[PDB]
Design a protein around this ligand. Sequence first.
Ligand SMILES: CCCCc1ccc[n+](CC(P(=O)(O)O)P(=O)(O)O)c1
Ligand SMILES: CCCCc1ccc[n+](CC(P(=O)(O)O)P(=O)(O)O)c1
Ligand SMILES: CC(C)CCOP(=O)(O)OP(=O)(O)O
Ligand SMILES: CC(C)CCOP(=O)(O)OP(=O)(O)O
Ligand SMILES: [Ca+2]
Ligand SMILES: [Ca+2]
Ligand SMILES: [Ca+2]
Ligand SMILES: [Ca+2]
Ligand SMILES: [Ca+2]
Ligand SMILES: [Ca+2]
Lengths: 362, 362
Amino acid sequence: MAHMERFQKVYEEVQEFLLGDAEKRFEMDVHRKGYLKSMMDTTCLGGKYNRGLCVVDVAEAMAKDTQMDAAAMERVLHDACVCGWMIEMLQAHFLVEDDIMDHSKTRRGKPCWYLHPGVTAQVAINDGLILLAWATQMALHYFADRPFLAEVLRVFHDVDLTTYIGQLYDVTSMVDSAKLDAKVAHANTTDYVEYTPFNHRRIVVYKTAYYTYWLPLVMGLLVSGTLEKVDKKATHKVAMVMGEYFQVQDDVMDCFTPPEKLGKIGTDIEDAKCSWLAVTFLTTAPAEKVAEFKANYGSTDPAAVAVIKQLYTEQNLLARFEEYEKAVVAEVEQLIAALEAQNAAFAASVKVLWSKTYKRQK
Amino acid sequence: MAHMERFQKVYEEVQEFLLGDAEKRFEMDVHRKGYLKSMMDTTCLGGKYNRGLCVVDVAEAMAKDTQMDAAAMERVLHDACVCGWMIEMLQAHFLVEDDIMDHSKTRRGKPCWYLHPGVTAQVAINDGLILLAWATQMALHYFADRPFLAEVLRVFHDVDLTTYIGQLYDVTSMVDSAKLDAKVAHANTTDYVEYTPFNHRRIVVYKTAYYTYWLPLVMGLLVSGTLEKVDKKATHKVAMVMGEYFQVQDDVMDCFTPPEKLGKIGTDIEDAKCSWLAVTFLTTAPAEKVAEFKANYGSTDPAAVAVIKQLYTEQNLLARFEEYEKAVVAEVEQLIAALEAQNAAFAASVKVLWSKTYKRQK
Ligand SMILES: CCCCc1ccc[n+](CC(P(=O)(O)O)P(=O)(O)O)c1
Ligand SMILES: CCCCc1ccc[n+](CC(P(=O)(O)O)P(=O)(O)O)c1
Ligand SMILES: CC(C)CCOP(=O)(O)OP(=O)(O)O
Ligand SMILES: CC(C)CCOP(=O)(O)OP(=O)(O)O
Ligand SMILES: [Ca+2]
Ligand SMILES: [Ca+2]
Ligand SMILES: [Ca+2]
Ligand SMILES: [Ca+2]
Ligand SMILES: [Ca+2]
Ligand SMILES: [Ca+2]
């Protein structure tokens, strides 16, 4: 991909800056500097970089569209790379903390950060907070003289909050919400009355769509000075449609994609997660199959988990996902066509992001 | 306290705004809104409000020293209260995450948030992140048209990073730093070679002094538009001296103050923390007492803990603290006198903060 070599060079630059700033400001010693370097490398690298490279693709598209000269283009691509690394380090923070919350075993084909024997959940919580803090440090340093710094911080921090509210919906989805009460232990549901299409949409739009689709598009517009050239409502809507679909794919792959190909071991079934598969099953399956689901879901027993995967297979959940995907293609294409009539350059950058999403396999 | 009634009124306003913003933006339901209200009240209320009320005391002192009409003074006090609550919600976030990391039992005379049976560590991590995100949301909303928004976000996020680096030093302080390696489990020290005055100072300056002393003084100056009317270097030095002392008091109280008075059960002795007591003991005690300390420290056995507290008592650590405290008050009074020669209004507000710190009992 066109910007990978530039994006990787900016990673080395931003790492040297952040570790050097810690030596200057916090009397950082050689041993902890080395620990933080390995933490940054382990938590920030190894993913697909769809969020970071989107910022650069958008910023280049809009820089060409507005005919920026060689010096201005070089600045926009460098700024775009730094904003990309803000989102990648936000992702790194989110996955560190989520791997602790889900008690997960593998991430990007390596042990979860907290499961490194030299780490533990106790230290990893704080390592994940350093990652989050470092994302803002990059804006405050690299964009100190840029009029777009204010808007970069606003959209970044808004999406940061959004994602934690989605995570609140996610971690409370398997308990009766009327019984959500800090003073009283919460039994996992046995009736699954709240496993609804509305509740699934609300989890995935807030926990995933905002930081995965909306934030990279907006940051690429902000760094190129072109946010006012596009339809904000139309941009938001296509980000929500693609983001929901992206997390639906992630939900389908939890069950049906081998962990060795995905690079992680999902436990949506053993954790009774309100996944797209769980909701689509519960709302479409015959009564006797719903009963077998309730008797087996949310159990660590490998046979129980196999019963659930057999129920999903027998209810044609992969076929049902394919019909959902067809409806999403129709809607994304219509929204892109509407963007394209207003600003073709930005519409092309949404098509790039959509082509890396549609029918992905990991 | 002059500003308590105004400060508690602004709490109720900020709470209504944040919960209402979540209903508006994130389709927040009545049950989770109730959960978040209970979480905010439990994690943000019940402390001494030293950080938040400092912001208002500094802002009022500096606004009175300027000539401005009643409407302008009302705006400075309201902004100061919001900035105070930013720091209180940052404190709330720090204590929620630290209580998970320390596996602690009590905070402000109630169970730790994560230990509420309807919460657990795996939900509380995310509740702690909501608190941190809400702090920035307050600035972005209330200070949307204020000239100091950018500099408020910069100092806030700088101190946010600083505290996590202090926390890194704190959580790694009991492992030989040459053996710090994410890949390899590492036994806690048996020789305590790194339990040095320098290493204690580095922990407490970054983990406590920046957010407890520096941040409230600087926010008070920013919201009143008077940061450039004071000596930034001298302000930093007095904040580092007072904040080191504040954390030394906290370390002494971990051992010597009844948990029912303190409102928390410290485990510095069980957890082998590099506390002021441990460093002062190891650098002053006779050789056989150092050996007995090493045989008993870092043990959950109540007999082992009782041996350490007896060794501390025998080495007169409370008297050694009184001598340190005499040296600190000599230094603070000199630094305040020097500030008073430059800006008497600001120096008075440093006296108010010091007066709440010096010889405190909790
Ligand atoms: C801590 C904030 C939550 C971040 C967040 C948002 C979206 C997806 N994830 C991770 C995924 P996964 O762990 O990559 O499968 P999920 O657990 O299925 O939701 C985490
Ligand atoms: C999560 C960042 C840590 C924040 C932080 C900094 C200063 C004091 N604390 C908590 C105190 P305490 O728990 O109030 O006694 P410590 O555990 O002694 O350090 C936490
Ligand atoms: C939003 C969610 C499914 C979390 C994982 O996101 P991802 O598949 O983009 O992960 P990588 O950053 O590893 O590419
Ligand atoms: C920095 C530290 C000792 C943590 C506790 O701070 P504190 O004693 O000011 O706590 P409150 O917010 O409960 O007053
Ligand atoms: Ca999760
Ligand atoms: Ca997960
Ligand atoms: Ca998943
Ligand atoms: Ca601690
Ligand atoms: Ca603690
Ligand atoms: Ca303490």
